Amino acid sequence: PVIPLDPARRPVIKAQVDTQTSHPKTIEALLDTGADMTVIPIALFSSNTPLKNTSVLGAGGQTQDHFKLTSLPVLIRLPFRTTPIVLTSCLVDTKNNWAIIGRDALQQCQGVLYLP
Amino acid sequence: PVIPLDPARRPVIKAQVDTQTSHPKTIEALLDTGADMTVIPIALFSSNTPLKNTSVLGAGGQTQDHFKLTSLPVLIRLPFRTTPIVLTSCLVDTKNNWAIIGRDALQQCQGVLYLP
Numbered sequence: 204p205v206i207p208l209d210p211a212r213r214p215v216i217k218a219q220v221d222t223q224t225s226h227p228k229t230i231e232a233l234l235d236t237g238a239d240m241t242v243i244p245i246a247l248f249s250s251n252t253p254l255k256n257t258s259v260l261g262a263g264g265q266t267q268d269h270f271k272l273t274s275l276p277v278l279i280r281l282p283f284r285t286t287p288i289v290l291t292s293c294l295v296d297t298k299n300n301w302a303i304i305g306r307d308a309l310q311q312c313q314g315v316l317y318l319p
Numbered sequence: 320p321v322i323p324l325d326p327a328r329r330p331v332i333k334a335q336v337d338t339q340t341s342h343p344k345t346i347e348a349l350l351d352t353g354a355d356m357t358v359i360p361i362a363l364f365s366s367n368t369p370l371k372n373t374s375v376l377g378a379g380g381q382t383q384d385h386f387k388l389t390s391l392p393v394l395i396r397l398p399f400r401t402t403p404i405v406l407t408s409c410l411v412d413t414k415n416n417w418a419i420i421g422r423d424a425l426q427q428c429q430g431v432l433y434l435p
């Protein structure tokens with residue numbers, strides 16, 4: 204669909220995420236064209252699960268430990284397209300539990316920004 | 320225009336930003352559906368001008384001192400549309416120079432995300 208843009212209202216989507224380490228789960232994710240890589244909560248993963256360390260730059264400054272990287276690809280299912288996004292690797296937010304669809308995912312479902 | 324989304328190419332636009340505190344300047348800015356509010360680098364303001372302290376939460380955590388809020392509206396002209404975006408207030412990057420066009424601005428362009 205066409206998603207209008209409003210400063211008062213985060214553009215969100217219901218995404219079903221399969222981390223491949225426990226059953227798939229629905230999350231509300233922020234559609235974010237300024238994110239290089241998708242971010243998913245640690246709450247999706249299991250207490251076991253190897254995850255790599257990774258340095259991440261945001262508006263809040265630089266961080267060594269808030270975000271980790273996935274060991275295995277993450278499958279994402281959007282409500283419309285029957286065919287999953289498969290991200291080879293993506294970020295895992297261990298501090299807050301943010302959910303951010305980034306351009307890695309948006310490219311794979313051929314998302315565009317349209318400015319009239 | 321139609322701006323494709325690709326994790327290796329940040330989506331940018333040349334924007335002419337009038338702080339109303341010195342000569343307008345054209346800068347390169349990121350198009351960012353994840354940003355509530357536009358960010359303009361402090362370099363586009365006079366050393367004289369009053370700015371308001373603000374706290375900002377972003378991927379890197381919380382920051383009291385890195386961003387300031389403007390005192391005068393900011394006028395932004397995009398290369399295609401003749402009428403300026405007018406933002407009552409927007410964020411100022413007091414450090415590392417970020418130029419981020421957020422949903423405040425994108426709403427005024429009739430900006431949208433399309434996902435087929």
Ligand SMILES: C[C@@H](NC(=O)[C@H]1N(C(=O)[C@@H](O)[C@H](Cc2ccccc2)NC(=O)[C@@H](NC(=O)[C@@H](N)c2ccccc2)C(C)(C)C)CSC1(C)C)C(C)(C)C
Binds near residue numbers: 261329352377
């Ligand atoms: C209140 C701020 N809001 C936000 O920052 C919102 N976000 C956004 O607006 C995002 O599009 C953010 C834009 C950004 C990138 C680099 C420095 C500064 C800002 N992108 C990132 O933080 C992403 N970081 C990156 O993509 C990183 N590789 C990068 C380094 C240098 C220049 C561009 C990108 C990611 C950690 C989410 C993957 C993600 S978190 C958020 C609260 C939803 C503000 C200051 C941008 C309005």
